[PDB]
């Protein structure tokens, strides 16, 4: 573990809302005078058991309620940044889901103020470079996403890219092609969740329609040889999340994971924690699961960690 923990890493697939530890959630509910549906921290944690992406999302979104003030968003992001410091993550390019908060009445400026403030601290105090990524909720309409992009324009320089998460299946990348086209037109790079629960077809759409710089997850590309060859050949990064895939049942076991297989084939795969508060581990716990269950070597360790550095935007 320690050896894995000491590797220089970049995290490129990480939802700030997904770093919301049960402990923090309760203390934020206390500071905001919110009565939680959960009786204690331990009952919330016990509820972190999922049969699929949606069961997790439902609870993930429920957790966002306690996020209401700028100081809430600062606390959230600063707590995660300290995790990065402990685990020697020297560079972060994290998602947030503005709609989850703006739709609850929290002003866009307030969400950003807290995150941005923390990121400044992370860089000047912790030495951690950052590239904030604004993610659209794919289960909502392109229209709502357009409205979100309008809110972000005055702020555009705070974001290096736009992303695309939430319920994948039945909401293909094509659904958001116009808004992505506009974000690019307005100077945004692009990334997207694809081939987590979704078909390889969604990965192609992400590549050619949304014109992404990297694929988030992308594990189901292993079903598509001609896409495999494309990945391998173009060296497009994949932000693979081991514990996430296991906990959401993408793989029945960590020993079933194809990330090393992909690495050995030349796919520029990386390791990320995704929603570490929900999946029982941050980036280092992800590297470790790989070693324990797939006998990953220090060799592939250094290699994966180096890819995350290479894949920075």
User: Would you say 103 is a known binding-site residue?
Assistant: no
* Terminal Cα-to-Cα distance of the chain (whole angstroms): 28
Query: Would residue 93 show up in a list of annotated catalytic residues for this protein?
Result: no
Positions in the binding site for Zn ion (CB under 5 A): 274
User: Would you say 288 is a known binding-site residue?
Assistant: no
Q: Rounded to the nearest whole angstrom, what is the least distance from the CB of residue 165 to Zn ion in the complex?
A: 5
Structure tokens at 140: 């909502």
Return left, alpha or beta for 68; rule: phi > 0 is left, psi -120 to 50 is alpha, else beta.
alpha
Q: Rounded to the nearest whole angstrom, what is the least distance from the CB of residue 292 to Zn ion in the complex?
A: 23
Measured between alpha carbons, how far is 142 from 270 in angstroms, rounded to an integer? 29
Q: Rounded to the nearest whole angstrom, what is the least distance from the CB of residue 18 to Zn ion in the complex?
A: 7
Measured between alpha carbons, how far is 113 from 70 in angstroms, rounded to an integer? 6
Which position's Cβ is nearest Zn ion? 274
Q: Which of 11, 21, 196, 205 is catalytic?
A: 196
Comparing CB distances to Zn ion, the nearer of 54 and 71 is 54
Are 138 and 95 spatial neighbours (Cβ–Cβ below 8 Å)? no
Structure tokens at 50: 């999922």
Comparing CB distances to Zn ion, the nearer of 56 and 73 is 56
CA torsion, ordered 264, 287, 308, 257, to nearest 10 deg: 40
Q: Rounded to the nearest whole angstrom, what is the least distance from the CB of residue 272 to Zn ion in the complex?
A: 8
Comparing CB distances to Zn ion, the nearer of 53 and 110 is 53
Comparing CB distances to Zn ion, the nearer of 18 and 22 is 18
User: Would you say 274 is a known binding-site residue?
Assistant: yes
> Three-state DSSP class for 127?
coil
Residues annotated within a binding site:
13, 15, 193, 274-275
Residues annotated within a binding site for Zn(2+):
13, 15, 193, 274
Residues annotated within a binding site for substrate:
275
Active-site positions read 196
């Amino acid at each position: 573990y320690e050896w894995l923990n000491a590797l220089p890493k970049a995290e490129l697939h990480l939802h700030l809302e997904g770093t919301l530890e049960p402990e923090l959630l309760f203390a934020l509910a206390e500071r905001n005078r919110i009565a939680l549906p959960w009786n204690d921290v331990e009952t919330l944690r016990k509820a972190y058991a999922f049969n699929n992406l949606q069961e997790f999302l439902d609870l993930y979104y429920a957790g966002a309620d306690v996020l209401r003030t700028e100081q809430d968003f600062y606390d959230l992001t600063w707590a995660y940044l300290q995790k990065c410091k402990a685990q020697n993550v020297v560079h972060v390019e994290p998602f947030f889901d503005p709609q989850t908060h703006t739709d609850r009445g929290i002003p866009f400026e307030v969400v950003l103020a807290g995150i941005r403030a923390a990121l400044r601290d992370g860089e000047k105090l912790l030495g951690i470079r950052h590239g904030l990524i604004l993610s659209f909720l794919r289960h909502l309409s392109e229209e709502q996403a357009q409205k979100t992009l309008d809110q972000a324009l005055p702020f555009r320089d705070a974001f290096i890219a736009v992303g695309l998460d939430s319920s994948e299946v039945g909401h293909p990348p094509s659904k958001f092609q116009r808004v992505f086209d506009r974000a690019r037109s307005e100077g945004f790079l692009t990334v997207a969740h694809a081939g987590e629960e979704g078909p390889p077809e969604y990965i192609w759409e992400a590549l050619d329609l949304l014109k992404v710089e990297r694929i988030d997850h992308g594990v189901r590309a292993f079903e598509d040889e001609r896409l495999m060859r494309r990945l391998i050949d173009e060296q497009i990064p994949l932000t693979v999340c081991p514990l996430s895939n296991t906990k959401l049942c993408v793989f029945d076991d960590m020993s079933q994971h194809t990330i090393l297989d992909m690495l050995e084939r030349g796919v520029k795969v990386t390791v990320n924690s995704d929603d570490p508060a929900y999946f029982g581990g941050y980036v280092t716990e992800n590297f470790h699961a790989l070693q324990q269950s797939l006998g990953m070597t220090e060799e592939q360790a250094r290699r994966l960690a180096q890819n995350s550095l290479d894949a920075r935007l």
